[model samples]
Target: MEYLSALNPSDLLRSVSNISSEFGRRVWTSAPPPQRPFRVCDHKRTIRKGLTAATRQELLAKALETLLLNGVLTLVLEEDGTAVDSEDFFQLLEDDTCLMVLQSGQSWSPTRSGVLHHHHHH
Candidate 1:
């Protein structure tokens, strides 16, 4: 399936509901916002290694919410401190995670630190 940069609100809600049912998880948009940072209790291993689709999707939803709420639908970064034009950026709202990357702009040669640094628009 072709990836979409943004999701239709209704469609996303429906999909999340379906997935929640399939995984026997109760999805609630009314979940209270976390007031503090905390460590994982039991499922840390699965999420870090991306072993569970449901967990991945949950994380993806939160990340996408952060981006969209901050008036951003895209994320661009440079790993080696090279310049890539904004025109080449792309986004995909997949079932597991939302991926934002540059296309045909620069070869992804990992740097020494090997991390993509991003500056999101506020």
Candidate 2:
């Protein structure tokens, strides 16, 4: 429970559909029984700014681009709450996938807290 002291838990559920597939499955298993089988859309557009005019391939690109800018955020979900796994943000810069997309100068707003806080305004 100490690990969960810092997490709100609700944030994870609110973005369950946006949570990474790999981690989402893990959360489903370790999360409290009441929190089992959480939903995750994993749909590219769910995180993108727009969906209609974008081609399927373009949508995927946009989603990845947005997620990349927000950094990778991991949250362990439970029935009562969530525990954010504190990790290094710079590590994402080392990821080949994240690096490739960053060249486009695209970035997601800090509002979407996935793996880290952007705190652009603050």
Which candidate number would show the highest lDDT if scored against the true structure?
Answer: 1
Task: Give the lDDT of residue 79 in candidate 2.
Answer: 23
Which residue pairs come into collision in candidate 1?
A: none
Q: For each candidate, give its TM-score against the true structure.
A: 0.18, 0.16
Off by over 4 Å in 1: 1-60, 66-68, 77-111, 114-122
For candidate 2, the 10 contiguous residues with the lowest summed lDDT are 95-104
Candidate 1 global TM-score: 0.18
- Residue pairs whose backbone atoms clash in candidate 2: 9-81, 9-82, 72-115, 73-114, 73-115
Candidate 2: C-alpha lDDT: 0.33
Tens-digit lDDT track of model 2 for 74-104: 4322221223323322232342111112223
Report how far residue 117 has shifted in candidate 1, in Å. Answer: 21
lDDT of each: 0.34, 0.33
